[PDB]
Amino acid sequence: PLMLDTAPNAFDDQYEGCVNKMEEKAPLLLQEDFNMNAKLKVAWEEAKKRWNNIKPSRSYPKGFNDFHGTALVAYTGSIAVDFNRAVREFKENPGQFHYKAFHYYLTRALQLLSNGDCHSVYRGTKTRFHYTGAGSVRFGQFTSSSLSKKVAQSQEFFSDHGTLFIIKTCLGVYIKEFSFRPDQEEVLIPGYEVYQKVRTQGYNEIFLDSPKRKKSNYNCLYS
Ligand SMILES: NC(=O)c1csc([C@@H]2O[C@H](COP(=O)(O)CP(=O)(O)OC[C@H]3O[C@@H](n4cnc5c(N)ncnc54)[C@H](O)[C@@H]3O)[C@@H](O)[C@H]2O)n1
């Protein structure tokens, strides 16, 4: 089983106060990430082509640029697992974090896309999660969920050995438009959202309620 807690070791940068500085420095940071992360570079190049195709269909929040769009498209792609792991295990050995720019752009994409609306979402997993009683919960990593319980419980994401999270999120963003899917009705939740009410029901249902945005352990680390 995996532990569900406040994600004390996750890279949870919210970039409070350094957005202008990051928008200037992240392009350089991105080249650095790529130079040491071949898988990310490939996922990004492929996502940039798809973004090019998606972009004309609609308008995006002011300040939302191609980096934000390409990061989000890439995330719904195959790179999510490796990225999330790197974020989750950050504090462990923060010398080899090669998603410095990627983490910023994806974080900023969701910040720009989130109006504040709250959602009832569901997330299915094939690995059992155990709440270790910390008092509250943060996912740490960016966390995918769906507006549809059907989707969350589908064999694609869930099995009896895993967990179904029933979540009320107010920072999650409906990113259907961006996904290589998009019938997954995905709501992407930032890892720094805190759920003040945690309730386990049965062996595989975890209810996460009372979301709140709280300060992160890291802030503008690479700015
Ligand atoms: N899960 C859903 O219901 C759902 C709805 S849309 C969606 C899509 O699924 C794809 C992958 O997303 P996902 O977030 O499941 C990938 P996520 O990084 O959760 O991968 C899950 C695996 O990573 C490891 N892991 C995850 N969390 C932890 C943890 N807290 N501690 C230790 N190890 C952990 C384990 O191997 C776990 O099985 C994306 O394309 C996303 O768009 N998933």
Curated annotation (Swiss-Prot):
Residue positions annotated to bind NAD(+) are: Y75, R123, Q141, S179
Localization recorded for this chain is: Cell membrane
Reaction(s) catalysed (UniProt annotation): L-arginyl-[protein] + NAD(+) = N(omega)-(ADP-D-ribosyl)-L-arginyl-[protein] + nicotinamide + H(+); NAD(+) + H2O = ADP-D-ribose + nicotinamide + H(+)
Lipid addition sites, GPI-anchor amidated serine:
S223
For the TR mART core domain, which residue ranges apply?
38-215
Which positions are tagged coiled coil? Answer: none
Q: Catalytic residues? A: R123, S144, E186
Q: How is the protein disposed in the membrane?
A: Lipid-anchor; GPI-anchor
* Physiological role: Has both NAD(+) glycohydrolase and ADP-ribosyltransferase activity (to a lesser extent).
Keyword set, alphabetical order: ADP-ribosylation, Cell membrane, Disulfide bond, Glycoprotein, Glycosyltransferase, GPI-anchor, Hydrolase, Lipoprotein, Membrane, NAD, NADP, Nucleotidyltransferase, Signal, Transferase
Name the organs or tissues of expression: Postthymic T-cells.
Query: Which species expresses this protein natively?
Result: Rattus norvegicus
Recorded superkingdom: Eukaryota
Record protein name field: T-cell ecto-ADP-ribosyltransferase 2
**GO biological process entries:** NAD catabolic process
